[PDB]
Structures are given as structure tokens and as C-alpha cells.
DNA sequence: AATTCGCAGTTCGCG
DNA sequence: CGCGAACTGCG
């Protein structure tokens, strides 16, 4: 199985290293025969000679164009003559590429920014994370000495905990009488001890939690001041810290540093992404937190050091149990994109799609288009029309069916071959024309993108089939992870079209897809009202809720099924309305604010506060019991006696503060907030005491009794002392609970005023 | 650093 | 200075 790739230099020449685990065994294949290159497009072939003479300086070294090669490729399906420019060393490319594109005789250059090792995996058609190979995983977390205002890592590391299938231990340099704590004399011995453990456990995967921004920058700076060789790598190297713009990320050669923090971000939407939060969110058992100053004083006074022990022990234990769950999922995502687990696990949705297209593009001899420079990214400004959203018949309805399309936007792409290479291609025999916007899409050949979309969805379909007939439950779970990722890969195509930074961005492709979507959704709605007498209560992009007023619970179901038969015959290609489910009751608040309950009693919400991190758990909780009292019980009164009793629990301060915390995210540098709400209030006030505040931090604040701006009374939740803090009850009534149930209960002749 | 669509609370500035 | 828009966050 392939694990990662990189290169080392050997006498000025690159050497690809491929890290394999072929049957329990770590192996390193070396490839000295791979040449870094990029692509040039010229005015005449007669320019190649003046281009080849182009030369650049690196680190005192002179950079030359090794050799040139003429090739034919397809740029956007058109045949294009291009000169492949070859180089002796990968680091030659970023030096010279600029000085080449500025040549008069060169129109542009392409695939000039592919990481040598990633390019190896493409060009050679190699795929990471492939095979039956069980990986040895080790998680680890640290604890540090935190005194405020200190520089980063000035204070020593107090503990280093780690976990695997055999359990957890903690390495520390004070006495703690716990059978899983190992005592040593000095912070240095502890580090060199942990360094030994990793060497003799020889894990394939090193699992942290935010190790890219904390645990590995500390372990490095401390290894600096203490002067320790941090030979974690299977080749003996130190953790290689890399700068991914905003933050950092750490690699460890011969292994896979699996930082879960970026995995949980992309994969799960949670209120806060603290390790403690995430562990309770994934496995349902609590995990208590121990805060920095508690760690400090407990370490200094030498008291209650057992408590800091189990915190650290449970940081490592959780982090393994977590990495255990999320690793195969990201293993299959690695296999699907064709790039290292380390890479994809840190990648955004757009980057994931592009690496996959970059692979397919190379397989189909398609010159990849560049990424937009500043100007092109500016002309990628004006937006397009999205879906059709129907201003709903606000209120409660009974006996309801939700019908939607099976994969509207991917199915539209395959059906009408929406692809930048088919868009308006002259000289075809057949075209599909897109509504409202009228782009022509050539039908004579499958487009680049639609060819992949179909291949994906078909492959997804074979997989489910192999799942159901397979016998190896390890295999089944893996397959399942793959197709779920294929689903999400498929369903990431339309956005990629309108993603302003994308290499294959096609605005035209994107608005086309939404224009069709609206024709298909609108026509299906007219044909269910006029032709089949349903009433369309609400409709959003790819589906609608409908009912036949006054008809039976089991009539509506049946006549719906009849309309599927009807409408599907009328829908071209893979377009297809399907029966999603039936809901004995459903309340519709506004556009994109709804809640249906099925015949079993499960309640599903959409756009509702009950599911937002920026609303307090007391609101979301009360709104839910409100939704139960209507949909599940029909008790409109109880839905008011519930609010009337919850408001009294706040006016008498009888409700836990832990419910009143509001979580919001920071999306920029604090210097860039044109206007300061309450989370930037606390954030500014927090980084003023010196805490790191990245774009992405979740501020978890609470609103205190007082007057004025909401922010002037906000405090981060950790600083909340209930004995010397009276939280603002009036706010959590008139700004948090009531406005979240008042829209549901105004529909019954109830005003906020008869809700306290 | 996937898209458009849309609700709404906080703040501040305008008549 | 009551109200509406800019700013913001997030499904």
C-alpha cells in the first residue's frame, strides 16, 4: 500500500521516495528517473530556441531549461500544440517559471505549480491508501506550562500522553501516583522518552488534535531550547513544519501525521470544536476539561496533580479512539482523490475536486487550465441565479409527502452534458439548450466533467452492489466509506463551476445547471397542482412538500406514487423525481424554515434555530419541546405552558449557565471587522490578554446582566463564575428563547406578551 | 477558499 | 433617537 511520497535531493538530482506498507512492512521505493516539468504555449515553434536559452538564479546556483519536448494535448477539448519544458531539479520551476511567462513569444504556461511528489502520483498513475493493510496508529497529546503573556513555548512541556490499542500512558517529570503515569527527572528525559516510544512502536499514523498548530510547534521549540534531535521520522528526520498560509501543518516522513482538527472541521458541524466537545459528540460519553491555569497552579503547588494526569491521559485516549473512527473514511478519500492522506485530510472541498480533475485531466491528455491571476479572479465577480425557492404557505399542514429529484444537479450535468468543453462548441450534430440563459452544450461526445460525473455515479452504484453481496465486513465498511465520499465528490461539481478560484471554473456551466434545475422543479410543480390536484406547500431547489387538502392519510401517499409514474416518463435521461417520505404533520415558518414529523414520530427540521451554534441551548431546547408539543402531541397549550415555565426558570436563575453559552465563529483577522458584534467583542478582549485568535476559532461566550450593547456584557464561558456573575435573564427571554418559539406560536394567536 | 438562497440578531448611523 | 440598513454568521 502507498502511504505518502516526497523527494530528497541526491547530488543535485531529485529522488522520489514512495513510502509503502506492503504486508506489515514499511518500504521506501526510490525513483531517480522522474523529471519536473511544466508546459509552455508559444507563438511559433521558432521561439523554443530563445526560450531554452532562458536562465534563472536560485541559491547562488544558475537554473537552466534542461530539455524541451513538443507534444499535442487537448486544452478544453480543442487540440493544442504545447512545448513541455523539463528541469533538472524541482526547485528550478518556481524560480524560472515567472521569467518564462514574461517572455514575449510565450502566450502562457500551464501546470507550473504542481508539487513534484503529487505530480509523481498523477503521471505514474499511483494511488495512496489502496489494499488490505492494517495501520499501526498512535495518538499523543501534550500539556504545557501556561503563564499569561508569555511567548509561545517559553514555558516547558509538563506531560506527554499517548494511546494505542493497548491503552494510554502519561510521561511526566513530577511524581503523580497513577498506574499509567511514568515519572522521569527532567522535561528533557520525558521528551527523549516519548521519542523512544514512537521509535519502538513505529506507528504508521501519528494522531494528534490540532497538532499542526500546537502540539508539534511546542515539541519543536522545546526540542530547540533544550537542544534535542527530534528524530520521529522513519528516516531519522525531525518533524518538518510547513506553512499553509494562515496556519501551519506538520509532516513526519515515513509516517502520516493525522491531525484530526481539520478533519472534524470539514466533516462535522458542531457547536465548538474543542476536543472535549468533539469526543462527547462522536461517542456520547462525557470528557471533562482541565483549563490552562488549573494545570499551571496544580503543577507549581504540586497539588491535585492526579487530576491533570487523567485529563492528559484522556486527551490521548480520546484522540486515539477518534482517529480510529475517522481514519478509514479519510483513507478512502485519499484513494479517491489520488493524493496523500496527509494532504487530503487538510484540504478544502475545492482543492479536493481539483486534485481529482488534475489526475483525470492527465489521464485524458487534457492540458489543465491555470488558476486565476488577480485580474481574472476580478472578472470572476458577478454571480448567477440559484435555485427556485417558493415563499411557503406558512403554517401547519397534515398528511404531507416530500418528493425530490434523485441528484438534481449531478443528473442535470450528465443529462445535458454541461461541461466547459461542450459549452458552445461549434460544429456539432446535437445540442441541448439551457433555459433562461440559452447556452449551447454539444451532445456529440461526453464532456470532460460529465464523463467523470457519470463514471463516479456508476462506480458508486457498482460499489453498493458489491457491498450488499460481500462477506468480508472489513471490506463492506471500506466500500461504504468510498461511495459516500463519491456521493460528496459528485455533489461538489456544480459549486466547483461557480467557485471563483477554480482551475476549471465555468460560470456558464454553473448558471445553466441552476436554470435547468428551475425548469425541472417548476414544471414538476405545475404538473402536480393542475394535473394531479396536489397543493404545493413549499418548494426549495430540488424538491417540494405537497398534499391533497382534505384527502386521506393513505390517499395522498397513493396519488403521490401515481404522480411519480407520470412525471418520470416526462423527465429526460437520469432526471427523476423520487418519493422521499411521508410526514403526518409539518410546520413551515418562512423560506427554508420548516419541520415535519413522520409516522414513527421522528422530527426533522430545516433552517431552524434548534440546530444552530449561534443560538443558546436553552432556546434550541425549548423550541424543540415546542415542536414536540405540536407535531408529536398536538398540545398547543402545553407548547405554551412549556415556554411559560421555561421563562420562569430564567427569571429565577434556576437554569444552568452551561445552556446559555452562544457559540460563534471568527472568519477573518480581528483587524478586519468593519463592525464589532459580541463575539468579536469577546475575541478582541481575549486576544488582548494574549490568546491566539485565528479565522476559525469558536468563541463560546455568555451574556451577563447589565445594560448597553450586547457585547459590553459578553464574557468567554471559561471566565464565568456563577457566584460572582448574574447572567442576563431578560436577554435570554426577549432575545433568545421567545423570538425562536414566537414564529412557531404566532401561527396560533399567541404573541410574545402572553408567553412569559 | 464549492455554489446561491435565505433568516435574523447586533450594531451604528441616519433623519 | 425609532427605524432601517450594513455587517455578520450560519444553515
Contacts of A707 (CB under 8 A, 6+ apart): A713
Contacts of A89 (CB under 8 A, 6+ apart): A9, A12, A13, A14, A36
C-alpha cell recorded at residue A159: 506531560
Taking the CA of residue A431 and the C1' sugar atom of nucleotide B14, their distance in angstroms comes to 54
Strand B nucleotides, any atom under 7 Å from protein beta carbons: they are 1-12
| β pairing state of A181-183 and A167-172 | parallel
Residue A247's SS3 state is: strand
Give a three-class secondary structure readout of A337-368. Answer: HCCCHHHHHCCCHHHHHHHHHHHHHHHCCECC
| Residue of A448, A170, A458, A157 whose CA lies nearest to A309 | A170
Protein residue at shortest CA distance from C1' of B8: A739
C-alpha cell recorded at residue A313: 491521559
Identify the burial level of A531 via C-beta atoms within 10 angstroms of its C-beta, where 0-12 means exposed, 13-18 middle and 19 or more buried: exposed
Taking the CA of residue A756 and the C1' sugar atom of nucleotide C3, their distance in angstroms comes to 26
Taking the CA of residue A715 and the C1' sugar atom of nucleotide B12, their distance in angstroms comes to 22
| Residue of A24, A3, A436, A446 whose CA lies nearest to A206 | A3
Regarding the domain delimited by A2-124, which CATH topology (the fold level of the hierarchy) does it fall under? DNA Polymerase; Chain A, domain 1 (3.30.342)
Q: Please tell me the distance from the alpha carbon of residue A76 to that of residue A363, in angstroms, as a whole number.
A: 14
Taking the CA of residue A540 and the C1' sugar atom of nucleotide B9, their distance in angstroms comes to 24
In the block, cell 504486508 appears at: A23
| Residue of A393, A391, A396 whose CA lies nearest to A627 | A396
A115 touches strand B (CB under 7 A): no
- Phi and psi at residue A680, to the nearest 5°: -75, -25
**Helix-helix angle A507-529:A408-416, to 10 degrees:** 110
In the block, cell 547562488 appears at: A60
b/e burial code for range A45-63 (CB count within 10 A of at least 16 → b): eebbeebeebebeeeeeeb
CB A540 within 8 A of CB A403: no
Of all nucleotides in the shown strands, which has a C1' nearest the CA of A698?
A: C9
Give a three-class secondary structure readout of A136-191. Answer: CEEEEEEEECCCCCCCCCCCCEEEEEEEECCEEEEEECCCCCCCCEEECCCHHHHH
C-alpha cell recorded at residue A630: 405540536
A372 touches strand B (CB under 7 A): no
Residue A712 marked as a ligand binder: no
Taking the CA of residue A751 and the C1' sugar atom of nucleotide C4, their distance in angstroms comes to 23
Residue A108 marked as a ligand binder: no
A709 touches strand B (CB under 7 A): yes
C-alpha cell recorded at residue A694: 485565528
Protein residue at shortest CA distance from C1' of B2: A495
Q: Please tell me the distance from the alpha carbon of residue A457 to that of residue A475, in angstroms, as a whole number.
A: 20
DSSP 8-state secondary structure symbol assigned to residue A124:
T
Q: Where are the beta strands (DSSP E) in A357-450?
A: 395-405, 431-433, 440-442
| Residue of A405, A741, A402 whose CA lies nearest to A538 | A402
Resolution in A, one decimal?
3.0
CB A432 within 8 A of CB A402: no
**Polymer length of chain A:** 756
Q: How far is CA A478 from CA A64, A458, A697, in A?
A: 47, 18, 32
C-alpha cell recorded at residue A65: 531549461
| Residue of A353, A209, A388 whose CA lies nearest to A282 | A209
Q: Please tell me the distance from the alpha carbon of residue A353 to that of residue A323, in angstroms, as a whole number.
A: 24
Taking the CA of residue A214 and the C1' sugar atom of nucleotide C10, their distance in angstroms comes to 27
Residue A373 marked as a ligand binder: no
C-alpha cell recorded at residue A339: 493524493
| Residue of A368, A371, A350 whose CA lies nearest to A489 | A350
Strand C nucleotides, any atom under 7 Å from protein beta carbons: they are 6-11
Rg of chain A's alpha carbons, rounded to an integer?
Answer: 30
- Phi and psi at residue A543, to the nearest 5°: -175, 175
Residue A591's SS3 state is: coil
b/e burial code for range A68-85 (CB count within 10 A of at least 16 → b): eeeeebebbbeebebbbb
Q: Please tell me the distance from the alpha carbon of residue A678 to that of residue A689, in angstroms, as a whole number.
A: 17
> What distance, in Å, lies between the first and last C-alpha atoms of chain A?
63
Q: Which residues pair with A251 in a beta bridge?
A: A240
Residue A552 marked as a ligand binder: no
Contacts of A408 (CB under 8 A, 6+ apart): A517, A520, A521, A541, A542, A575
Q: Please tell me the distance from the alpha carbon of residue A173 to that of residue A385, in angstroms, as a whole number.
A: 62
| Residue of A261, A231, A305 whose CA lies nearest to A141 | A261
| β pairing state of A26-31 and A37-42 | unpaired
- Residue A530: count other Cβ atoms within 10 Å of its Cβ: 9
Using a CB cutoff of 8 Å and minimum separation of 24, what contacts does A384-387 make? Answer: A384/A498, A384/A507, A384/A510, A384/A511, A384/A514, A385/A436, A385/A511, A385/A514, A385/A515, A385/A518, A386/A514, A386/A541, A387/A514, A387/A517, A387/A518, A387/A521, A387/A540, A387/A541, A387/A542
Q: How far is CA A715 from CA A219, A382, A693, in A?
A: 31, 40, 15
- Phi and psi at residue A237, to the nearest 5°: -85, 170
Protein residue at shortest CA distance from C1' of C7: A675
Q: CA A745, A749, A754 angle in degrees (round to 5)? A: 75
CATH 1.10.132.60 fits A603-754, yes or no: yes
Q: CA A7, A11, A12 angle in degrees (round to 5)? A: 65
| β pairing state of A543-547 and A395-405 | antiparallel
Identify the burial level of A673 via C-beta atoms within 10 angstroms of its C-beta, where 0-12 means exposed, 13-18 middle and 19 or more buried: middle
Of all nucleotides in the shown strands, which has a C1' nearest the CA of A714?
A: B10
- Phi and psi at residue A662, to the nearest 5°: -110, 130
Contacts of A568 (CB under 8 A, 6+ apart): A576, A577
CB A564 within 8 A of CB A577: yes
Taking the CA of residue A14 and the C1' sugar atom of nucleotide B10, their distance in angstroms comes to 56
Of all nucleotides in the shown strands, which has a C1' nearest the CA of A699?
A: C9
Q: Please tell me the distance from the alpha carbon of residue A574 to that of residue A734, in angstroms, as a whole number.
A: 50
* Torsion on CA atoms A464, A540, A409, A430, rounded to nearest 10: 130
Positive/negative CA dihedral, A349, A355, A361, A363: negative
A389 touches strand B (CB under 7 A): yes
Residue A540 marked as a ligand binder: no
Positive/negative CA dihedral, A449, A450, A452, A457: positive
Q: Please tell me the distance from the alpha carbon of residue A747 to that of residue A397, in angstroms, as a whole number.
A: 12
| Residue of A283, A276, A272 whose CA lies nearest to A326 | A283
DSSP 8-state secondary structure symbol assigned to residue A688:
T
Of all nucleotides in the shown strands, which has a C1' nearest the CA of A736?
A: B9
CB A109 within 8 A of CB A39: yes
Of all nucleotides in the shown strands, which has a C1' nearest the CA of A676?
A: B11
| Residue of A353, A322, A323 whose CA lies nearest to A336 | A353
CB A516 within 8 A of CB A434: yes
CB A327 within 8 A of CB A334: no
b/e burial code for range A283-304 (CB count within 10 A of at least 16 → b): eeeebeebeeeebbebbeeeee
A347 touches strand B (CB under 7 A): yes
In the block, cell 404531507 appears at: A400
CATH of segment(s) A137-346? 3.30.420.10
Q: Which residues pair with A104 in a beta bridge?
A: none
DSSP 8-state secondary structure symbol assigned to residue A704:
B
A494 touches strand B (CB under 7 A): yes
Q: Please tell me the distance from the alpha carbon of residue A72 to that of residue A74, in angstroms, as a whole number.
A: 7
In the block, cell 510547534 appears at: A217
Q: Please tell me the distance from the alpha carbon of residue A320 to that of residue A162, in angstroms, as a whole number.
A: 8
Amino acid at each position: 500500500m502507498i502511504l505518502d511520497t516526497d523527494y530528497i535531493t541526491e547530488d543535485g538530482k531529485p529522488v522520489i521516495r514512495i513510502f509503502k506498507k506492503e504486508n506489515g512492512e514499511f518500504k521506501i521505493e526510490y525513483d531517480r528517473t522522474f523529471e519536473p516539468y511544466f508546459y509552455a504555449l508559444l507563438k511559433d515553434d521558432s521561439a523554443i530556441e530563445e526560450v531554452k536559452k532562458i536562465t534563472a538564479e536560485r541559491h547562488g546556483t544558475v537554473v537552466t531549461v534542461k530539455r524541451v519536448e513538443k507534444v499535442q494535448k487537448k486544452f478544453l477539448g480543442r487540440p493544442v500544440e504545447v512545448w513541455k519544458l523539463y528541469f533538472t531539479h524541482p526547485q528550478d520551476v518556481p524560480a524560472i517559471r515567472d521569467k518564462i511567462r514574461e517572455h514575449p513569444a510565450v502566450i502562457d504556461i500551464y501546470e507550473y505549480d504542481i508539487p513534484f511528489a503529487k505530480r509523481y502520483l498523477i503521471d505514474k498513475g499511483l494511488v495512496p491508501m489502496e489494499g488490505d493493510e492494517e495501520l499501526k496508529m498512535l495518538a499523543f497529546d501534550i500539556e504545557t506550562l501556561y503563564h499569561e503573556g508569555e511567548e509561545f513555548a517559553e514555558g516547558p512541556i509538563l506531560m506527554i500522553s499517548y494511546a494505542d490499542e493497548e491503552g494510554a500512558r502519561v510521561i511526566t517529570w513530577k511524581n503523580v501516583d497513577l498506574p499509567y503515569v511514568d515519572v522521569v527527572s527532567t522535561e528533557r528525559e520525558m521528551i527523549k522518552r516519548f521519542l523512544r516510544v514512537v521509535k519502538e512502536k513505529d506507528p504508521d499514523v501519528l494522531i494528534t488534535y490540532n497538532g499542526d498548530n500546537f502540539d508539534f510547534a511546542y515539541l519543536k521549540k522545546r526540542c530547540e531550547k533544550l537542544g534535542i534531535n527530534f528524530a520521529l521520522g522513519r528516516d531519522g528526520s525531525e518533524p518538518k513544519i510547513q506553512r499553509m498560509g494562515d496556519r501551519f501543518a506538520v509532516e513526519v516522513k515515513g509516517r502520516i501525521h493525522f491531525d484530526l482538527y481539520p478533519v472534524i472541521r470539514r466533516t462535522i458541524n458542531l457547536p465548538t470544536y474543542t476536543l472535549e466537545a468533539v469526543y462527547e459528540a462522536v461517542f456520547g460519553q462525557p470528557k471533562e476539561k482541565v483549563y490552562a491555569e488549573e494545570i499551571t497552579t496544580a503543577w507549581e503547588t504540586g497539588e491535585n496533580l492526579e487530576r491533570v494526569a487523567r485529563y492528559s491521559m484522556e486527551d490521548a485516549k480520546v484522540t486515539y479512539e477518534l482517529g480510529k473512527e475517522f481514519l478509514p473514511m479519510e483513507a478512502q478519500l485519499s484513494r479517491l482523490i489520488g493524493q496523500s492522506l496527509w494532504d487530503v485530510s487538510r484540504s478544502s472541498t475545492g482543492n479536493l475536486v481539483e486534485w481529482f480533475l488534475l489526475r483525470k485531466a492527465y489521464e485524458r491528455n487534457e492540458l489543465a487550465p491555470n488558476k486565476p491571476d488577480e485580474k481574472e479572479l476580478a472578472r470572476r465577480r458577478q454571480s448567477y441565479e440559484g435555485g427556485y425557492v417558493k415563499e411557503p404557505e406558512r403554517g401547519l399542514w397534515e398528511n404531507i409527502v416530500y418528493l425530490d429529484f434523485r441528484s438534481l444537479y449531478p443528473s442535470i450535468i450528465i443529462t445535458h452534458n454541461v461541461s466547459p468543453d461542450t459549452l458552445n462548441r461549434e460544429g456539432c450534430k446535437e445540442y441541448d439548450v439551457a433555459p433562461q440563459v440559452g447556452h449551447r452544450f454539444c451532445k456529440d461526445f461526453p464532456g470532460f466533467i460529465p464523463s467523470l460525473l457519470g463514471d463516479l455515479l456508476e462506480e458508486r452504484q457498482k460499489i453498493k452492489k458489491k457491498m450488499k453481496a460481500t462477506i468480508d465486513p472489513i471490506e463492506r465498511k471500506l466500500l461504504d466509506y468510498r461511495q459516500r465520499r463519491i456521493k460528496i465528490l459528485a455533489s461538489s461539481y456544480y459549486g466547483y463551476y461557480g467557485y471563483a478560484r477554480a482551475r476549471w471554473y465555468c460560470k456558464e456551466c454553473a448558471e445553466s445547471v441552476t436554470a435547468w434545475g428551475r425548469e425541472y422543479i417548476t414544471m414538476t410543480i405545475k404538473e402536480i397542482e393542475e394535473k394531479y390536484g396536489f397543493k404545493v406547500i413549499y418548494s426549495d431547489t430540488d424538491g417540494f412538500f405537497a398534499t391533497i387538502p382534505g384527502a386521506d392519510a393513505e390517499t395522498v401517499k397513493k396519488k403521490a406514487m401515481e404522480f411519480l409514474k407520470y412525471i418520470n416518463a416526462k423527465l429526460p435521461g437520469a432526471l427523476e423525481l423520487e418519493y422521499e417520505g411521508f410526514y403526518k404533520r409539518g410546520f413551515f415558518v418562512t423560506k427554508k424554515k420548516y419541520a415535519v414529523i413522520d409516522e414513527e414520530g421522528k422530527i426533522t427540521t430545516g433552517g431552524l434555530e434548534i440546530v444552530r451554534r449561534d443560538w443558546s441551548e436553552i432556546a434550541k431546547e425549548t423550541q424543540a419541546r415546542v415542536l414536540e408539543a405540536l407535531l408529536k402531541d398536538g398540545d398547543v397549550e402545553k407548547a405554551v405552558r412549556i415556554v411559560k415555565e421555561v421563562t420562569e426558570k430564567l427569571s429565577k436563575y434556576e437554569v444552568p449557565p452551561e445552556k446559555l453559552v452562544i457559540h460563534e465563529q471568527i472568519t477573518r483577522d480581528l483587524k478586519d471587522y468593519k463592525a464589532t458584534g459580541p463575539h468579536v467583542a469577546v475575541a478582541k478582549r481575549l486576544a488582548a490578554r494574549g490568546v491566539k485568535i485565528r479565522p476559525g476559532t469558536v468563541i463560546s461566550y455568555i451574556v451577563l446582566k447589565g445594560s448597553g450593547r450586547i457585547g459590553d456584557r459578553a464574557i468567554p464561558f471559561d471566565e464565568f463564575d456563577p457566584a460572582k456573575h448574574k447572567y442576563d435573564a431578560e436577554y435570554y427571554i426577549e432575545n433568545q428563547v421567545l423570538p425562536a418559539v414566537e414564529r412557531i406560536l404566532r401561527a396560533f394567536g399567541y404573541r410574545k406578551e402572553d408567553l412569559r
